[PDB]
Enzyme design. Structure first.
Site, PDB file in Angstrom:
ATOM      1  N   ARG A  83       0.837  -1.224   0.000  1.00 17.10           N
ATOM      2  CA  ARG A  83       0.000   0.000   0.000  1.00 17.10           C
ATOM      3  C   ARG A  83       0.865   1.265   0.000  1.00 17.10           C
ATOM      4  NH1 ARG A  83      -4.286   2.967  -1.533  1.00 17.10           N
ATOM      5  NH2 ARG A  83      -5.987   1.850  -0.455  1.00 17.10           N
ATOM      6  N   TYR A 231       5.650  -1.045 -10.553  1.00 21.43           N
ATOM      7  CA  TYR A 231       4.360  -1.742 -10.610  1.00 21.43           C
ATOM      8  C   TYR A 231       3.192  -0.828 -11.007  1.00 21.43           C
ATOM      9  CZ  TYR A 231       0.474  -4.775  -9.458  1.00 21.43           C
ATOM     10  OH  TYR A 231      -0.689  -5.535  -9.547  1.00 21.43           O
ATOM     11  N   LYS A 240      -3.245   5.829 -14.026  1.00 14.70           N
ATOM     12  CA  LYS A 240      -3.970   6.608 -12.978  1.00 14.70           C
ATOM     13  C   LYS A 240      -3.400   8.029 -12.821  1.00 14.70           C
ATOM     14  CE  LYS A 240      -6.606   3.143 -11.609  1.00 14.70           C
ATOM     15  NZ  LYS A 240      -8.096   3.186 -11.758  1.00 14.70           N
ATOM     16  N   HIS A 260     -13.228   7.813 -12.900  1.00 16.27           N
ATOM     17  CA  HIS A 260     -12.962   6.399 -12.713  1.00 16.27           C
ATOM     18  C   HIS A 260     -14.201   5.601 -13.095  1.00 16.27           C
ATOM     19  CE1 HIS A 260     -11.422   3.186  -9.585  1.00 16.27           C
ATOM     20  NE2 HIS A 260     -11.034   2.897 -10.816  1.00 16.27           N
ATOM     21  N   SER A 282     -12.443   0.083  -6.812  1.00 17.44           N
ATOM     22  CA  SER A 282     -11.756  -1.217  -6.759  1.00 17.44           C
ATOM     23  C   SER A 282     -12.547  -2.275  -5.986  1.00 17.44           C
ATOM     24  CB  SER A 282     -10.364  -1.054  -6.124  1.00 17.44           C
ATOM     25  OG  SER A 282      -9.711  -2.311  -5.938  1.00 17.44           O
ATOM     26  N   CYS A 284     -15.308  -3.667  -6.818  1.00 20.82           N
ATOM     27  CA  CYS A 284     -16.767  -3.557  -6.922  1.00 20.82           C
ATOM     28  C   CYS A 284     -17.292  -3.799  -8.291  1.00 20.82           C
ATOM     29  CB  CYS A 284     -17.245  -2.201  -6.374  1.00 20.82           C
ATOM     30  SG  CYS A 284     -16.771  -1.940  -4.690  1.00 20.82           S
ATOM     31  N   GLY A 285     -16.463  -4.265  -9.227  1.00 30.29           N
ATOM     32  CA  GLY A 285     -16.958  -4.856 -10.462  1.00 30.29           C
ATOM     33  C   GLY A 285     -17.173  -4.047 -11.709  1.00 30.29           C
ATOM     34  N   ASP A 307     -12.528   1.323 -17.171  1.00 27.26           N
ATOM     35  CA  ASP A 307     -11.853   1.949 -16.014  1.00 27.26           C
ATOM     36  C   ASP A 307     -11.797   3.478 -15.987  1.00 27.26           C
ATOM     37  OD1 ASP A 307     -10.227   1.279 -13.343  1.00 27.26           O
ATOM     38  OD2 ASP A 307      -8.753   2.409 -14.518  1.00 27.26           O
ATOM     39  N   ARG A 401      -2.968  -8.746 -11.942  1.00 30.06           N
ATOM     40  CA  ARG A 401      -3.580  -8.175 -13.107  1.00 30.06           C
ATOM     41  C   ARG A 401      -3.240  -8.916 -14.364  1.00 30.06           C
ATOM     42  NH1 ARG A 401      -7.137  -3.494 -12.061  1.00 30.06           N
ATOM     43  NH2 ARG A 401      -6.627  -2.963  -9.905  1.00 30.06           N
ATOM     44  N   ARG A 432     -19.920  -1.602  -2.409  1.00 29.86           N
ATOM     45  CA  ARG A 432     -20.300  -2.780  -1.647  1.00 29.86           C
ATOM     46  C   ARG A 432     -20.992  -2.317  -0.378  1.00 29.86           C
ATOM     47  NH1 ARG A 432     -17.440  -7.919  -2.233  1.00 29.86           N
ATOM     48  NH2 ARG A 432     -16.242  -7.856  -4.185  1.00 29.86           N
ATOM     49  N   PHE A 520     -23.874 -10.196 -11.988  1.00 34.73           N
ATOM     50  CA  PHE A 520     -23.186 -10.544 -13.199  1.00 34.73           C
ATOM     51  C   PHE A 520     -24.093 -10.334 -14.401  1.00 34.73           C
ATOM     52  CE2 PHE A 520     -20.963 -12.522  -9.674  1.00 34.73           C
ATOM     53  CZ  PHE A 520     -19.696 -11.939  -9.844  1.00 34.73           C
ATOM     54  N   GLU A 522     -27.015 -11.056 -15.014  1.00 28.98           N
ATOM     55  CA  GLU A 522     -28.343 -10.708 -14.583  1.00 28.98           C
ATOM     56  C   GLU A 522     -28.514  -9.204 -14.353  1.00 28.98           C
ATOM     57  OE1 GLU A 522     -30.247 -13.031 -15.124  1.00 28.98           O
ATOM     58  OE2 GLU A 522     -29.310 -14.920 -14.556  1.00 28.98           O
TER      59      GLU A 522
END
Ligand SMILES: Nc1nc2c(ncn2[C@@H]2O[C@H](COP(=O)(O)OP(=O)(O)OP(=O)(O)O)[C@@H](O)[C@H]2O)c(=O)[nH]1
Ligand SMILES: [Mn+2]
Ligand SMILES: [Mn+2]
Ligand code: NA
Length: 612
Positions: A83, A231, A240, A260, A282, A284-285, A307, A401, A432, A520, A522
């Site tokens: 982090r 990285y 970013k 984002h 991040s 959360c899909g 993204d 990734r 979430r 997904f 759905e």
């Protein structure tokens, strides 16, 4: 008088003389400072790329994944994916231009560094830092070449891994230099921070300098300067640093938005198409939604981006969006035929994987791949150890990734590279939330929708729920209160067709911890409802938090016994607590820079909740 500051003798590809004047100054100035052995001006060619991959292969920097067509695996020093928003900073004359000054605590909305302090840090890091290495010069476009929404950068790096990855994630090479001419560009300077001879031992053939790692943004100088990490967002400076941090400040100055957000196109069974954008944090899909395979017959989803979204109102009032990236830098774990079949089909060629596991037949493996292996097939983890399913440690790093070309996605949108961009009709926020927040609601107005973005919270991954306004908490290029004002100002623009704003929650759980919505593919059923609302269909019920779907408005056929009472329940006790928490957060963290319109939406929501 001697050789001047002329580094021509060290150029191993290209020519300093063919560079635009200001690009040459940037390259030679940093060559003088960092003292690389050679300068390689990237051309972006297939031959350049293949040979650099083979070189990295020969040195043990990457391995070839023999199961696939031109795929590769890098395993990092585990210190280089720790982090580091503590080491991510923005430099401005005044702190307040970068982050609001908080009332009680420390800011959660950015990290300022003074110019004085940065210059000391820089002087302690960059002099001689590329000794014994090649300085690669990466000319890159963020967005389609010749899009009026595109911006150009030049990245200097001593990492061939960065070169390879930037070819995928940006448009890179000679064509960019030719398009640039004498125009403006963002100066991107990167070093892994390990000059030769190495002063410290190299771990896993992965050069980095964790103790000195520092990722800096200087918007008033149009510069990104990053030291010590090889990285991801720290080294691929388009990803970013440019895409969100610098770009959000450029957006502020120029009248557009850098967010984002995924961008997807959705077509209904009568051939009508709409573009939507969605901001989730991040984990959360976003990538799942952008590439969704819809379950509802006659519907089609196509992917523009997964993204980053750069969005500007045009002269007709349409909100035009481009994807400024050229690829997907997607989280590997959790990606399966089930959760993202289109990703599975994109990444089986010409893809670079970082920090995943390798199977004995030369394939990739990770938690949630949902793809059993034949008896006898064994797994090497991302730490280069033998790995078994009955061990404590995961086989892939949790945020490992893939890095894959966008052009290979089987549902890439035919206008994913259109220079004018695509017209956005809806913006979606979400995170979430295990309790209290319904599957979907719609904001009451633009001002309410900006408040909904501002109030976003998400469970961190006892559990903790944290604020992540607009899914931009790690990424604001400037004061978040001023960002809110910038968003609000779109409403006072000539002829603007302000998109409908929604909030989703894929993640609400029942009292035993089970998800109430299957999600997904759905989620197409939620998008159908949004599509209809944009079209003005009478499918909404008013509540204190916004509009929700009427009883029977959502197509739930084939889903069996979905607990709709619980999934759409809105409780006064929950929402009383919610608004109080949001009030205190905005007071503390935004303080004197909170726009009047946001405070007014907060008051209004509190009032509507009080009358339940
Ligand atoms: N329950 C549920 N989980 C989902 C859904 N869509 C995605 N996920 C979960 O979201 C996670 C993957 O999201 P990421 O790829 O981390 O999210 P992202 O927004 O693309 O993040 P970045 O690439 O970091 O910007 C996995 O845990 C998935 O299981 C959904 O519809 N329902
Ligand atoms: Mn993603
Ligand atoms: Mn992201
Ligand atoms: Na390695």
């Amino acid at each position: 008088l001697h050789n001047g500051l002329d580094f021509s003798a060290k150029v191993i590809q290209g020519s300093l003389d063919s560079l635009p004047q200001e690009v040459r100054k940037f390259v030679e100035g940093n060559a003088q400072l960092c003292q690389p052995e050679y300068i390689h001006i990237c051309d972006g060619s297939e031959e350049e790329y293949g040979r650099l991959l083979a070189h990295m292969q020969e040195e043990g920097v990457i391995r070839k994944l023999k199961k696939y067509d031109n795929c590769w695996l890098a395993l990092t020093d585990p210190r280089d994916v720790a982090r580091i928003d503590s080491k991510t900073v923005i430099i401005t004359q005044e702190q307040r231009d970068t982050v609001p000054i908080p009332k009680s605590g420390q800011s959660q909305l950015g990290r300022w560094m003074s110019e004085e302090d940065f210059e000391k840090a820089f002087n302690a890091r960059f002099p001689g830092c590329m000794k014994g290495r090649t300085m690669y010069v990466i000319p890159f476009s963020m967005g389609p070449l010749g899009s009026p929404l595109a911006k150009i950068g030049i990245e200097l790096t001593d990492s061939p891994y960065v070169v390879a990855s930037m070819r995928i994630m940006t448009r890179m090479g000679t064509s960019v230099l030719e398009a640039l001419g004498d125009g403006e560009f963002i100066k991107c300077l990167h070093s892994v921070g390990c000059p030769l001879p190495l002063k410290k031992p190299l771990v896993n053939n992965w050069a980095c300098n964790p103790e000195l790692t520092l990722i800096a943004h200087l918007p008033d100088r149009r510069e990104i300067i990053s030291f010590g990490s090889g990285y991801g967002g720290n080294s691929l400076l388009g990803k970013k640093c440019f895409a969100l941090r610098i770009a959000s400040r450029l957006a502020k100055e120029e009248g557009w938005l850098a967010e984002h957000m995924l961008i997807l196109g959705i077509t209904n069974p009568e051939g009508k198409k709409k573009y939507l954008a969605a901001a989730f944090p991040s984990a959360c899909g976003k990538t799942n939604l952008a590439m969704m395979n819809p379950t509802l017959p006659g519907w089609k989803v196509e992917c523009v981006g997964d993204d980053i979204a750069w969005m500007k109102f045009d002269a007709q009032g349409n909100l035009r969006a481009i994807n400024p990236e050229n690829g997907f830098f997607g989280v590997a774990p959790g990606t399966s035929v089930k959760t993202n079949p289109n990703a599975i089909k994109t990444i089986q060629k010409n893809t670079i994987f970082t920090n995943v596991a390798e199977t004995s037949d030369g394939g990739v493996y990770w938690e949630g791949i949902d793809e059993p292996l034949a008896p006898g097939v064994t797994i090497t983890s991302w730490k280069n150890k033998e790995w078994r399913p009955q061990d404590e440690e995961p086989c892939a790093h949790p945020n490992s990734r893939f890095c894959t070309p966008a052009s290979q996605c089987p549902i890439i949108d035919p206008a994913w590279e259109s220079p004018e961009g695509v017209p956005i009709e809806g913006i979606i926020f979400g995170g979430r939330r295990p309790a209290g927040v319904p599957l979907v609601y719609e904001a009451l107005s633009w001002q309410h929708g900006v408040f909904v973005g501002a109030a976003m919270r998400s469970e961190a991954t006892g559990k903790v729920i944290m604020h992540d306004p607009f899914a931009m908490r790690p990424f604001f290029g400037y004061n978040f209160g001023k960002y809110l004002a910038h968003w609000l100002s779109m409403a006072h623009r000539p002829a603007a067709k302000l998109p409908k704003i929604f909030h989703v929650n894929w993640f609400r759980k029942d009292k035993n911890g089970k998800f109430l919505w299957p999600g997904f593919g759905e989620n197409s059923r939620v998008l159908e409802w949004m599509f209809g609302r944009i079209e003005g269909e009478d499918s909404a019920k008013l509540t204190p938090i916004g509009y929700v779907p009427k009883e029977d408005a959502l197509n739930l056929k084939g889903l069996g016994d979905v607990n709709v009472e619980e999934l759409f329940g809105i409780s006064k006790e929950f929402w009383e607590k919610e608004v109080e928490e949001i009030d205190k957060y905005l007071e503390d963290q935004v303080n004197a820079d909170l726009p009047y319109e946001i405070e007014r939406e907060l008051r209004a929501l509190k009032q509507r909740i009080s009358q339940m």
